[PDB]
Amino acid sequence: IVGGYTCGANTVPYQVSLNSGYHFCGGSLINSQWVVSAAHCYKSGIQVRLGEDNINVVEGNEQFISASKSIVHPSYNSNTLNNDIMLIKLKSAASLNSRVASISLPTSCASAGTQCLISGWGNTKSSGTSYPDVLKCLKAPILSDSSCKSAYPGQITSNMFCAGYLEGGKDSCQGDSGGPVVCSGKLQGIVSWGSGCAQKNKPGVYTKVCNYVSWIKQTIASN
Ligand SMILES: N=C(N)c1ccc(CNC(=O)[C@@H]2CCN2C(=O)[C@H](NCC(=O)O)C2CCCCC2)cc1
Numbered sequence: 001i002v003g004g005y006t007c008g009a010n011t012v013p014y015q016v017s018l019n020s021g022y023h024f025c026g027g028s029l030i031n032s033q034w035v036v037s038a039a040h041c042y043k044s045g046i047q048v049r050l051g052e053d054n055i056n057v058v059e060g061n062e063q064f065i066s067a068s069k070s071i072v073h074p075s076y077n078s079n080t081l082n083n084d085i086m087l088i089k090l091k092s093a094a095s096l097n098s099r100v101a102s103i104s105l106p107t108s109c110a111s112a113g114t115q116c117l118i119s120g121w122g123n124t125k126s127s128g129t130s131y132p133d134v135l136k137c138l139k140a141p142i143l144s145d146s147s148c149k150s151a152y153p154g155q156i157t158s159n160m161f162c163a164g165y166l167e168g169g170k171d172s173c174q175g176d177s178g179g180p181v182v183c184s185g186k187l188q189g190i191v192s193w194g195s196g197c198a199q200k201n202k203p204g205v206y207t208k209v210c211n212y213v214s215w216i217k218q219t220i221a222s223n
């Protein structure tokens, strides 16, 4: 997260860290046994870390659970990042409490102008490299489709939406991948892609979760 602020220990209870010996992507807990992340985060040998704040220090509220199975969206395209969504099932149910909670799926897609909260442990430099150990947060609005498409001609599909600031300075970045974009108490997006980080006229692109609610519900009910 570039140009954001420290969330504060466990203020974003649904945030998860995907770990393969180190943090490599974020994710969202949707219920006690399932995590939603981005397809481009796909990897074998994943441990899901819940109740995390400082990822390098055991503070006492963590739950480390291995993934039993991963399901990448059937139509995921690794070249364009269309349908960048993946589901991860935990080997055992996580204990839900104040510091570890699930986020609700959307009943509809949010409108442009809606303010959202994006969070992650990714890079904090627009031109450089500096990774934080505590969770970072950023409030950002969903941009109009025109602004989004003007920025990335011929690359935006109906399964994507832009969020952030066209002036730059504030944006998600590498390391935040798979993380949540919550607006009005619902999971509206997943940190997917962009051009560099926090660059002028290059806003962040996110997976539009509202289009996948049916797939999510049917898939988890059958696995
Ligand atoms: N909001 C942001 N600024 C932002 C947030 C998270 C990320 C991390 N995600 C990635 O790196 C994923 C896998 C490759 N892809 C990219 O972002 C690529 N650009 C890479 C680039 O131009 O930096 C995109 C460019 C557009 C065609 C698909 C590949 C990148 C940017």
Ligand SMILES: [Ca+2]
Residues within 6 Å of the ligand: 052, 053, 054, 055, 056, 057, 058, 059, 062
């Ligand atoms: Ca910790």
